[PDB]
Motif scaffolding. Sequence first.
Motif, PDB file in Angstrom:
ATOM      1  N   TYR A  25      61.394 -10.285  -8.134  1.00  0.00           N
ATOM      2  CA  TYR A  25      60.963 -10.714  -6.814  1.00  0.00           C
ATOM      3  C   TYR A  25      61.304 -12.191  -6.739  1.00  0.00           C
ATOM      4  O   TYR A  25      61.646 -12.805  -7.754  1.00  0.00           O
ATOM      5  CB  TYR A  25      59.470 -10.446  -6.556  1.00  0.00           C
ATOM      6  N   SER A  26      61.249 -12.764  -5.545  1.00  0.00           N
ATOM      7  CA  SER A  26      61.590 -14.170  -5.397  1.00  0.00           C
ATOM      8  C   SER A  26      60.526 -14.942  -4.642  1.00  0.00           C
ATOM      9  O   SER A  26      59.824 -14.394  -3.791  1.00  0.00           O
ATOM     10  CB  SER A  26      62.949 -14.309  -4.700  1.00  0.00           C
ATOM     11  N   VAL A  27      60.419 -16.224  -4.970  1.00  0.00           N
ATOM     12  CA  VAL A  27      59.436 -17.113  -4.364  1.00  0.00           C
ATOM     13  C   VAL A  27      59.928 -17.754  -3.074  1.00  0.00           C
ATOM     14  O   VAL A  27      61.066 -18.208  -2.995  1.00  0.00           O
ATOM     15  CB  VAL A  27      59.044 -18.229  -5.359  1.00  0.00           C
ATOM     16  N   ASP A  59      68.204 -19.141  -0.168  1.00  0.00           N
ATOM     17  CA  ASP A  59      66.926 -18.877  -0.813  1.00  0.00           C
ATOM     18  C   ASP A  59      67.143 -18.456  -2.258  1.00  0.00           C
ATOM     19  O   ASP A  59      68.232 -18.632  -2.799  1.00  0.00           O
ATOM     20  CB  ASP A  59      66.178 -17.777  -0.059  1.00  0.00           C
ATOM     21  N   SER A  62      66.667 -15.291  -3.293  1.00  0.00           N
ATOM     22  CA  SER A  62      66.760 -13.834  -3.291  1.00  0.00           C
ATOM     23  C   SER A  62      67.706 -13.310  -4.364  1.00  0.00           C
ATOM     24  O   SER A  62      68.643 -13.997  -4.784  1.00  0.00           O
ATOM     25  CB  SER A  62      67.220 -13.322  -1.919  1.00  0.00           C
ATOM     26  N   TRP A  63      67.448 -12.083  -4.797  1.00  0.00           N
ATOM     27  CA  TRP A  63      68.258 -11.435  -5.814  1.00  0.00           C
ATOM     28  C   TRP A  63      69.491 -10.759  -5.246  1.00  0.00           C
ATOM     29  O   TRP A  63      69.526 -10.360  -4.082  1.00  0.00           O
ATOM     30  CB  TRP A  63      67.448 -10.369  -6.550  1.00  0.00           C
TER      31      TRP A  63
END
Lengths: 387, 387
Positions: free
Chosen positions: B49-51, B371, B373-374
């Motif tokens: 997940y991403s912050v 961002d 994001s993955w």
Amino acid sequence: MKITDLELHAVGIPRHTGFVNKHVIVKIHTDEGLTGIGEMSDFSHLPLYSVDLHDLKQGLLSILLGQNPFDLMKINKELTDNFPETMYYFEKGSFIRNGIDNALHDLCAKYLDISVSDFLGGRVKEKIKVCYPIFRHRFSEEVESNLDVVRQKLEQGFDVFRLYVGKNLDADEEFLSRVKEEFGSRVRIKSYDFSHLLNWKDAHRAIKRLTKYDLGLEMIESPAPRNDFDGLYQLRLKTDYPISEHVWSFKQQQEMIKKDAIDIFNISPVFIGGLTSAKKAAYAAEVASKDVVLGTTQELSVGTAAMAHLGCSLTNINHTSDPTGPELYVGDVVKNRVTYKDGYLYAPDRSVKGLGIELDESLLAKYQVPDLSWDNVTVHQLQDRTA
Amino acid sequence: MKITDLELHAVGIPRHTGFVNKHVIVKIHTDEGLTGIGEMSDFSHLPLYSVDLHDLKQGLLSILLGQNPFDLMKINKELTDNFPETMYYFEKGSFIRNGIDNALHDLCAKYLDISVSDFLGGRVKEKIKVCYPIFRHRFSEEVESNLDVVRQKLEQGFDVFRLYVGKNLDADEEFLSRVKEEFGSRVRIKSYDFSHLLNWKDAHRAIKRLTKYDLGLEMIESPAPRNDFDGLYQLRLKTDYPISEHVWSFKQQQEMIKKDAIDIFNISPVFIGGLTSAKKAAYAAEVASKDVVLGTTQELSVGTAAMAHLGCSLTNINHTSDPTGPELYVGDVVKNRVTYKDGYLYAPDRSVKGLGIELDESLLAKYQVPDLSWDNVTVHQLQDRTA
Ligand SMILES: O=C(O)[C@@H](O)[C@H](O)[C@H](O)[C@@H](O)C(=O)O
Ligand SMILES: O=C(O)[C@@H](O)[C@H](O)[C@H](O)[C@@H](O)C(=O)O
Ligand SMILES: [Mg+2]
Ligand SMILES: [Mg+2]
Ligand SMILES: [Mg+2]
Ligand SMILES: [Mg+2]
């Protein structure tokens, strides 16, 4: 029978007391048009960062897409592979896995036209005794307000409560003194929860004074720092009352079992990753002849229904449990909320397929939030859930 | 001297080998115009997940705004209060605190017109020996390519390497056999890193097999599951070679000390929350008469400069270390990358105030990403850092 899509609905729902929590409602769609609903309950806990939901949906989809929802062991293994257990009470990945797994339970049950209850081992009971939470006392001037809460909730049917303690022992003691004086034996406070605030010896001195008031006390919860297995054990040997602690990872649970550190394992889907993981934890406790209590992060009706089904299927829950989320929130996202009567949480109608709950789209829109970002909140408020 | 603003710059920089890592460059501004630069290194580790950086900036500013940057203890306490240690190797909160704390060091040092080195206790050495990482073998067909890597890096000056193992023991052994055969004693492989993939007994069997090839072997790293202190201890008794393990939380470090579970503490700012936290961990190891090695997540020049200063100040680093980030990444965000020569990482010029590095705004813009994001990546790739 395969998963085709996923939806994540972010909602913000405040508690009557003021604290505002953000939750994520899950929808898992399938090629046959059947949808499972779940809940990633209460993300409003430390750490103070938030998860990007657009990114999360993509990541979860990559895992779920094309899978057979009945492959619960396979899917949960892949979920844990991507969102590993961290030995931390509030790991957001645990809340995420929980939402996917309970949605999968809803989905499978609906497909088979049975209640999630029958998918988890059936019923041992039809309802489970729960308790209403009383705020941690920071100052003695808060005692009066908390007594009002007890008086009102008792009239409403809640005769058992739990008290968060450890910040101001003088205030805690004044409250307990006042409660026994006014209600006598009409009310019980089944647990004194330290929230991992004190080292075990300090907790011991606290416990020694707080236990002078036994209003049907059933357990002392989290009386040592997080993961302080030796401390819990030493305190378990010096305390007559059962020591309870939350299960936040299998590794942590294994260590507490091996050291015989506690008496009661507080298990809740949200902190361990879902119903599948909560069941494993509950069965591990059973294999070790240990008692279990259904814990809570205080979830909405979807999350509460899920745990209600699980709780009513276990043979080793012989103490009062904690889920009273719908009683704390000013709103919800369902057509009909779970039911509480005389201090008991009722498992949803066994005749209704799935979780036994239905989402209300107008409420999902009403409480919709753009993301899981934080608002102004202090560490004390995050620990005590106050505002 | 008060903090007035904060900037978080997300960057995406691929490694020569294909893996693309996202980092966050930190800028802390003050009322007097002085800015400290830092780095939240490599967020590209599980969980998947991403912050949200917009939310994170608000939360971090809430903590930092108006503070005196010299109050490192106070600020680090507040950082830890909001981003607690989780007993997890890759807690993103640790990467976050690290970026703020190393930026604060840069800021304080610049204000006093001294190198961060003189703010950390001075120099014990001017450079530290490091090693180049060789990819984990999943198939025997990868052996040839990895031998070419050793041949190429040795020519570049890296005579010491470390090897990730544990996935395909037959392949691990083939590689080691071929290295000894083709290089004799020209190359050393100081560590065999199991990345917590095996339970300790399986690791014992693997070690017994691999240690038949001792090419200047210095340690066996992470030969047990995460936080398996007793397993590490049992293996430490059955293994002649030193056992090393990463320090990801104070609780974890203290437990390994109490149980004399390991021989070498692998400490790196990014995994423990920054330079302030890394110094505490290093001093705790010193108090316990334990050896230390400077670990890495493979950071950019800003993060590498920070750890270089720390590493050159410690008296208990008597083994080969791991930070070779700037040698793995195709790009960076600075005017002049940190210097590596003959397998040594040189600490930045002690005469240059601050970290000794300067951001290159054109590069910051060049590698900017929207961002954290993955992108598409498998669990195997995340644990092996392959593509
Ligand atoms: O048993 C406990 O420690 C509580 O249920 C605790 O988890 C609370 O913080 C809860 O999660 C809440 O949000 O009220
Ligand atoms: O020692 C280790 O385990 C490695 O440095 C490990 O942390 C790697 O995954 C590193 O973080 C990388 O991104 O290459
Ligand atoms: Mg509790
Ligand atoms: Mg909660
Ligand atoms: Mg390692
Ligand atoms: Mg890394």
